[PDB]
Design a protein around this ligand. Structure first.
Ligand SMILES: CCc1c(NC2CC2)nc(N)nc1N1CCN(C)CC1
Length: 154
């Protein structure tokens, strides 16, 4: 089967907010904010909760921009990551136990220090296109297979 995750990108006209993950899965890489969706909350509410937990930020509106499915070799559950974007945020981002936030100019996104799949689908995010992606990983650095397409409905 698969398990629901969220990822939130705060994308403003000339900059994008990322967080350096300080512990847990994916520590040492910049990423959007998010995590597992809990029983009893919608996917979008889980995305808002994780954004607040990791950054302190709240948002007026979250927009669905993508879905990415991950297979990790030897792991039974696929990860079904629902990706959201927003321009307007409420608050100034602050460091949490999990994330250290930082703004990046759109031509200085730190892909070499992000999950490798981001290099593939982040351009579509920046181009405001909706997308469906699938990435097969062995370990945390090697993409074995992938698919990526633009979609009309996320
Ligand atoms: C570990 C899955 C993953 C990812 N690809 C990994 C397969 C290589 N790439 C990005 N940008 N985020 C990812 N997660 C989504 C949910 N987050 C909250 C945590 C991290």
């Amino acid at each position: 089967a698969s398990r629901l995750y969220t990822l939130v990108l705060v994308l403003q006209p000339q900059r994008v907010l990322l967080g350096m993950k300080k512990r847990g899965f994916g520590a040492g890489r910049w990423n959007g904010f998010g995590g597992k969706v809990q029983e009893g909350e919608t996917i979008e509410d889980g995305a808002r909760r994780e954004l607040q937990e990791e950054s302190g930020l709240t948002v007026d509106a979250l927009h669905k921009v993508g879905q990415i499915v991950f297979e990790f070799v030897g792991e039974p559950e696929l990860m079904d990551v629902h990706v959201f974007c927003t321009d307007s945020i409420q608050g100034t981002p602050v460091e949490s136990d999990e994330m250290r936030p930082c703004w990046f100019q759109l031509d200085q996104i730190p892909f070499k220090d992000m999950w490798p799949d981001d290099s593939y689908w982040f351009p579509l995010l920046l181009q405001k296109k909706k997308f469906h992606g699938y990435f097969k990983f062995q370990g945390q650095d090697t993409i074995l297979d992938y698919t990526l397409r633009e979609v009309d409905t996320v």
